[PDB]
Amino acid sequence: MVYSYTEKKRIRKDFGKRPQVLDVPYLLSIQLDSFQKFIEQDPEGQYGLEAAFRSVFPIQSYSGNSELQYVSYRLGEPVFDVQECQIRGVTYSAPLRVKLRLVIYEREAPEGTVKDIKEQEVYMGEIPLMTDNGTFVINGTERVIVSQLHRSPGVFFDSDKGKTHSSGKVLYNARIIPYRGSWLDFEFDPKDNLFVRIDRRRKLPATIILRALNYTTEQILDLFFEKVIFEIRDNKLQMELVPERLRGETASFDIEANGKVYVEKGRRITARHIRQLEKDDVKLIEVPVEYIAGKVVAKDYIDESTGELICAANMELSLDLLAKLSQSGHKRIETLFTNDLDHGPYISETLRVDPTNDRLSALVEIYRMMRPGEPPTREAAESLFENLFFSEDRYDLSAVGRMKFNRSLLREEIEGSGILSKDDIIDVMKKLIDIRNGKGEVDDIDHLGNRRIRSVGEMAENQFRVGLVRVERAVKERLSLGDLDTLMPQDMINAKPISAAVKEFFGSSQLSQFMDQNNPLSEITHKRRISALGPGGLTRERAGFEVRDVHPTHYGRVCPIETPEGPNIGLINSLSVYAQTNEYGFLETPYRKVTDGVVTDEIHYLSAIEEGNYVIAQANSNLDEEGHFVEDLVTCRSKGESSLFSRDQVDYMDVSTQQVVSVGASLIPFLEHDDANRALMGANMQRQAVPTLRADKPLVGTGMERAVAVDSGVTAVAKRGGVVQYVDASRIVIKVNEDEMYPGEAGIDIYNLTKYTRSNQNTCINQMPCVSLGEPVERGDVLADGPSTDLGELALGQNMRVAFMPWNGYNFEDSILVSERVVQEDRFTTIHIQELACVSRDTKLGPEEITADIPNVGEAALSKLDESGIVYIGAEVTGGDILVGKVTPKGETQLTPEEKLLRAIFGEKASDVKDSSLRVPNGVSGTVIDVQVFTRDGVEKDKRALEIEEMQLKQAKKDLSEELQILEAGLFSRIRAVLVAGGVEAEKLDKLPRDRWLELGLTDEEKQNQLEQLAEQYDELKHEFEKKLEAKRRKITQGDDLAPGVLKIVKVYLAVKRRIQPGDKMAGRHGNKGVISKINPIEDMPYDENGTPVDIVLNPLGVPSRMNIGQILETHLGMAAKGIGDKINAMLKQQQEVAKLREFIQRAYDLGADVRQKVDLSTFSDEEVMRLAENLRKGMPIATPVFDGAKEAEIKELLKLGDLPTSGQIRLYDGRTGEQFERPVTVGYMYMLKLNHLVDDKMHARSTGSYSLVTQQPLGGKAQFGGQRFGEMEVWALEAYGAAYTLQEMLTVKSDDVNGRTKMYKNIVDGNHQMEPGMPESFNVLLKEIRSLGINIELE
Amino acid sequence: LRPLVPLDGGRFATSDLNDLYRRVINRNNRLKRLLDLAAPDIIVRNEKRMLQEAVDALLDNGRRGRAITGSNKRPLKSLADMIKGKQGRFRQNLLGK
Secondary structure (H helix, E strand, O other): OOOOOOOOOOOOEOOOOOOOOOOOOOOOHHHHHHHHHHOOOOOOOOOOHHHHHHHHOOOOOOOOOOOEEOOOOEEOOOOOOHHHHHHHOOOOEEOEEOOOEEOOOOOOOOOOOOOOEOOOOOOOOOEEOEOOOOOEOOOOOOOEEOEEEEEOOEEOOEOOOOOOOOOOOOOOEEEEEOOOOOOEEEEOOOOOOOEEEEOOOOOEEHHHHHHHOOOOHHHHHHHHOOOOOOEOOOOOOEEOOOOOOOOOOOOOOOEEEOOEEEEOOOOOOOHHHHHHHHHOOOOOEEOOOHHHHHOEEOOOOOOOOOOOOOOOOOOOOOHHHHHHHHOOOOOEOOEEOOOOOOOOOOOHHHHHHOOOOOHHHHHHHHHHHHOOOOOOOOOOHHHHHHHHOOOOOOOOOOOHHHHHHHHHHOOOOOOOOOOOOHHHHHHHHHHHHHHHHOOOOOOOOOOHHHEEEEOHHHHHHHHHHHHHHHHHHHHHHHHHHOOOOOOOOOOOOOOHHHHHHHHHHHHOOOOEEOOOOOHHHHHHHHHOOEEOOOOOOOOOOOOOOOOOOOOHHHOOOEOOOOOOOOOOOOOOEOEOOOOEEOOOOOEEEEEEEOEOOEOOOOEEEEOHHHHHHOOEEOOOOOEOOOOOEOOOOEEEEOOOOEEEEOOOOOOEEOOOHHHHOOOOOOOOOOOOOOOHHHHHHHHHHHHHOOOOOOOOOOOEEOOOHHHHHHHOOOOEEOOOOEEEOOOOOOEEEEEEOOOOOOOOOOOOEEEEOOOOEEOOOOOEEOOEEOOOOOOEOOOOOEEEEOOOEEOOEEOOOOEEEEEEOOOOOOOOOOOEEEEHHHHHOOOOOEEEEEEEEOOOOOOOOOOOOEOOOOOOOOHHHHHHEOOOOOEOOOOEEOOOOOOOOEOOOOOOOOHHHHHHHHOOOOOOOOOOOOOOOOOOOOOOOEEEEEEOOOOOOOOOOOOOOHHHHHHHHHHHHHHHHHHHHHHHHHHHHHHHHHOOOOOOOHHHHOOOOOHHHHOOOOOOHHHHHHHHHHHHHHHHHHHHHHHHHHHHHHHHHHOOOOOOOOOOOOEEEEEEEEOOOOOOOEEEOOOOEEOEEEEEOHHHOOEOOOOOOOOEEEOOOHHHHHOOOHHHHHHHHHHHHHHHHHHHHHHHHHOOOHHHHHHHHHHHHHOOOOOOOOOOOOOOOOOOHHHHHHHOOOOOOEEOOOOOOOOHHHHHHHHHHOOOOOOOEEOOEOOOOOOEOOOOEEEEEEEEEEOOOOHHHHOOOOOOOOOOOOOOOOOOOOOOOOOOOOOHHHHHHHHHHOOHHHHHHHHHHHHHOHHHHHHHHHHHOOOOOOOOOOOOOOHHHHHHHHHHOOOOOOOO | OOOOOOOOOOOOOOOHHHHHHHHHHHHHHHHHHHHHOOOOHHHHHHHHHHHHHHHHHHHOOOOOOOOOOOOOOOOOOOOOOOOOOOOOOOOOOOOOO
16 A cells, blocks of 8 residues: 555654554554543443443432432533634533432332322533543643553562561561452561451451351361361271371371381381372271370360360360360361461461450440441441451452452452452451461562553542442431431432542542643653552652562553652652553553464554463564464573573464663664663653744654654544635645545535643644645645644754864863754744733622723823734743733722812822722833633623624634534535526526526426425525534623633733743753853854754763763664765756655665665655645655664665765864864764753843842742842851851841841942841741740840 | 731631630630629639639640531631741741832
């Protein structure tokens, strides 16, 4: 196929011989999938709103004979649009419908029902939706929830050996963690007794809680233990033989088995004497009496003669007790094994130490342990034991609870009961007794097989379920109040719990947050993030050791490279490109199947548990056409390591080498060359790059960003593409082809481009058309580019000329040196859009009118402001100028009746003293974008917003009127087509309407049917179009919901052009980011043999120093790319024919060995790529894969083909002195980065400013005041320099002393130079606070 | 000289300063008017125990029965937030301004 319509403009040259069979997924499918499964209707009852409604429902009061059955729910359409709602700045949520049905049962009468209750839907809460890009719209914010990672529910096997306990031995423990409710754990102590800890409470013995499970000691020893066999007939003392049950013996006498001695007295206990009686078949044997006293009794045997309780179970036997038991006529005797080799004497110390032998006293004791304040009344002990242990509501084992419970339980069926089971917890106690016995394997805490990610679906299901229970309580009170309630689900269900749970959840949460938007990159990699923060998964606020480490399970799913290099490290992760989430929350990664010796084309997704046992080959390997591997021993991995394995030991394949990296670090080329640390730093620096004016696609790249830019939702794509009709910067429309269309409604697809708009990062966003007109568009083609995007290809930075050189010491360490040429080329210039809102109103003194006067200010600002309205759009605001005038009532009336009706108050009318004006803060100057102000209902006499309220009506009327003309024009042309042969007239119909008078009469049928029809759908489309136009205009003029604490809201957008700056900062793809020392003239830049001064000058010492390899191959390969583009550009300077250049272009594509499917000239050869030569005339789009990237052989081969010297070094002359520098010099072209670190934003100079009423210290930075801060380190720095002055007057004169500032500024006059030492007022805040303290100190 | 640094930008909320303000205001005013008015054993006992817990509870012990537990600001424990902001008076004085 290789159609490549949308990529025909720029075909990025790809390298490497490793094909990708599985294409890059939409990659947002975790949030999109979680959302589409969060709102769904299914009969199976999948997790979501249906699972919550089925969980709580039916809602029945206690002894009320009334139930509430769920009709489930259906979602409606929101009141606003996506982009329009974001512009309005109101939360975006759809109402919920399909209320639950009620029921009524007759009291004292079984099955009696008065009537069935089916009620109409009731409004409950508001359910927000998600944009196609994965965001959430609340109050005009981005509101994305970070993915969560924590422990998956199931039986845990933990080591938990304390290093601070000093014991030096491992203490095993196991804890079952349900999805909700209390936690149940077991705890060892050196006494070797199983203990139980529930919700941090003190650990009780196993015998008291298991006794609370109503199991007698006979069932304890007979259940958890084997009673073996003991038989006594006339004191024959015959017992069964268990030669394979123990290794050992102690023999003080001979023991004969079936007429032959198995082990002689004093004979060896070795396996020679063991297997003799073991391999042979032996039956019960008779041995003397002395062997009973050593054994421990198992079952409970009492004397048959009298009724005493002697010889109770779990007790030691005495020599004199044998005579009392054996002579009592007991039928059989059960004795405990109790020999420690592979086992241990568990539960014994629990039975002995446990005070409560019965379930009742056990429930009373666990109740007293649960509640310290109230003594147990024994009445509620059963409900506390059941609801605390095994119950439907308080368990919530969910899916992974029973899945992992049966997996570790070694069960068969996956589905199980959602509550605790006695045999299940007994199995946990038995297998845990095996863990204490030494057999079995523990589980790793950091192993992701025990971890499951949680998303918006499960989290919003949890909070929404909690709110639904909060509703179930009050509704239970309402149904329990009355005996019979007709039409109950009306006023009984309140929306405040739902709207508070979902609106408080998505509104305020640790995971839910707005994003800082720099390029689509930071938006998508900020959209996909793994967080151990929030509920669960957070061990401590700081430090930690094994939690922050990297497990082998971090290979193919989470990216170890991308990471929060700041205070918390190793917590936030990034999923793989091909990673996916399983049904239980587990993470699966692709592996290609291999059958016999050939590699089949099917790929299966495997989690950590499944891929742990299987062996998978290394990412890079040799492949043959027959499917077999070239090398016999192929590098493969099984568990926690990798080694060469045979061709028969490889189960699966890794496909691409990019599975271990993420979208953030995957766009950094030559990863295998560059060091992982500096690649981590660069990947951390990729997200802060601000978009610039002109986006130039990176000439060195990957080819993943092609899918990232289109899959990021930032660019404007096209649905059902076709022949483009009209284009514009505001709007783009396309005529859809007739290949695939809907039969109804006809019409064409229209698009509204977003203009310059403020982001959360105060950046500039917009989309620009990539097509001219009349160009065919396919499905999925990007029409317009977002910020920092060029032709659907992501470029967040700008290339520029590069030379490696020390220059006159102006480049030191990481310092950067920028030419004035790029300064003159407008490159790196960006727009910063800050928003200014003046909103007050709300006064009991009367309303506040906007503008119309500026009190106590001359006409200077009145020239900028309109008489009845605000300032002109796109004006110059400098300093403290008033952008939007606002007044206040203030004193209003007074004596001299409001100054004689505002006579002495001049023309304000308020009276005087209105401070409500906006008054733009100092230091911020720029041009305003648009004033959105506010829109309210029933508001009149507002000159502001009139132009935009009219502009919206003209816009919707324009673009809707286009479709109206397409419809009415189409049907009118259909009339002109049907009137043929029925009395047609070209000269008449081509100069008049009606169509000869509604197709005349013709043959009767066409008259009434065709004419009456034409009028029917004509007036139907006209009247319907006008009705929908009025319905839309009503939505335009109705406005939104304003905050009740204000009458009118005013908000304005302003923009500033900020370009390359001397201090600034710059960053590389490989992690070098530094400040610019000085911007040098063009004349001072060294030039080549052609006299081309160099744009940038960096420090080559940082390559060995900071271990940055990829900069050499970056600059050199870039010099090759711009060598191709430079030679082709020279061909355009010579005006060569297409074919002569076409040969060099084709050679440029296919040079090297394979490593691409692209073929030049394939399609017509005279267009497309032919014009793409004029597209790439500036530079060549060369791409390298992450680990598959280019090699120095092909790099020097291409660069040598570009006529450039193969060594990548050109003889250079000084731009200053003109003399030649000794030795060749490395030059090239690399991709650079402009950040938000510019020193207009970072640097603020301040002298004197506002202070605070607390201690008289100023607030701090960003207030245009304060001296920043010199902390205790600077206090000890002045004590270190030995200056008493600077420190003493430092802490005192500036803040704690007014006398120092007054006398200081007074001494500035004539320069007395003295500064008052003063008495610190902050020290008077210490003396003050101490005076508030009960010990008050006063000076003498 | 009093000024207190609010955590929320200057709000007093439910804190035991406000609890001891509501109890110590009425108990202290009624204790002053009761002591100066020679109140009987009922008013002097109730005002002496309520005011005794007003002056004594702010000093030490007491029950933090303030508003509802959780989802509320409770910046009173030892009443040491006045003398020590975080590690001490450093933020106010003796440290960097």
